[PDB]
């Protein structure tokens, strides 16, 4: 066996930026990794393809995954509406960390965030489940379209996504 690899082809107002690939830590957080994997292939009939990164804060993170309401109040998991925090084994140690956004204890859905810096104050509150494997330069380019309060200057969308491995 081996951990799954998923990719996102990022676009800015429709123009292709590039591909970001992530390794999902299925060995430590199997349920959380599977949720993200399935949402990336779209195999349950809904998923990330075509959704946007609605909140980008330079020097902090890029947030996305709201494919239902597209504004941060929506989205859902492949297990129903929301699911528990699997475990807090992994930490937000640096840029490239993939972690679950939430609304408090045990409220994981589909929203996630890619760290562009170490964000240790989120340790034990947000479930870390993967990391950027390739394309960190693409995430950095995305960061340039963010702002202090999170509002993006241009539309950053997941033009395509799926599983590589």
């Amino acid at each position: 066996m081996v951990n799954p690899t998923v990719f996102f082809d990022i676009a800015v107002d429709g123009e292709p930026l590039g591909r970001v690939s992530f390794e999902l830590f299925a060995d430590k957080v199997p349920k959380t990794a599977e949720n993200f994997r399935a949402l990336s292939t779209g195999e349950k009939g809904f998923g990330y393809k075509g959704s946007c990164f609605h909140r980008i804060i330079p020097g902090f993170m890029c947030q996305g995954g709201d494919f239902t309401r597209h504004n941060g109040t929506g989205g859902k998991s492949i297990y129903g509406e929301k699911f528990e925090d699997e475990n807090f084994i992994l930490k937000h140690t640096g840029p490239g960390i993939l972690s679950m956004a939430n609304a408090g204890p045990n409220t994981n859905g589909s929203q996630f965030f890619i760290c562009t810096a170490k964000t240790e104050w989120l340790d034990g509150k947000h479930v870390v489940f993967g990391k950027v494997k390739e394309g960190m330069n693409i995430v950095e380019a995305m960061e340039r379209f963010g702002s202090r309060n999170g509002k993006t200057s241009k539309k950053i969308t997941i033009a395509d996504c799926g599983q590589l491995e």
């Binding site: 902090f60 939430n102 609304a103």
Partner: peptide, 11 residues
């Protein structure tokens, strides 16, 4: 604040 919530944004 620098939080990543889904719904009600805090400080």
């Amino acid at each position: 604040v620098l939080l990543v919530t889904t719904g009600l944004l805090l400080a």
